[PDB]
């Protein structure tokens, strides 16, 4: 009776990448991370830990 072990406190993380323009450079990039943890650490904590 051994169970799968998801030690990592992230239950799901997905990131999307959109467009950004600073003043002239419109080829820039905009990261849109989106994560949920299981509760041991809040999302912002897991992000900075990684």
Partner 1 sequence: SNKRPLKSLADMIKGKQGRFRQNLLGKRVDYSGRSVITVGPYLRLHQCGLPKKMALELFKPFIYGKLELRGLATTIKAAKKMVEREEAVVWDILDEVIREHPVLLNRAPTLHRLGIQAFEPVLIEGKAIQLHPLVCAAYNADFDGDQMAVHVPLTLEAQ
Residues that bind partner 1 (CB under 8 A): 18-19, 23-24, 26-27
13 binds a second copy (CB under 8 A): no
Give me the least distance between CB of 26 and partner 1, in Å please.
6
Cα–Cα distance for residue pair 3/25, rounded to 1 Å: 51
Is 1 or 16 the residue whose CB approaches a second copy more closely?
Answer: 16
Is 19 or 50 the residue whose CB approaches partner 1 more closely?
Answer: 19
Phi, psi at residue 44, to the nearest 5°? -60, -25
CB 41 within 8 A of CB 13: no
């Amino acid at each position: 009776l051994l169970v799968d072990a998801c030690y990592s406190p992230v239950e799901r993380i997905a990131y999307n990448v959109e467009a950004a323009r600073v003043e002239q450079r419109t080829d820039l990039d905009k990261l849109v991370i989106e994560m949920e943890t299981n509760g041991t650490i809040d999302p912002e904590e897991a992000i900075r830990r990684a």
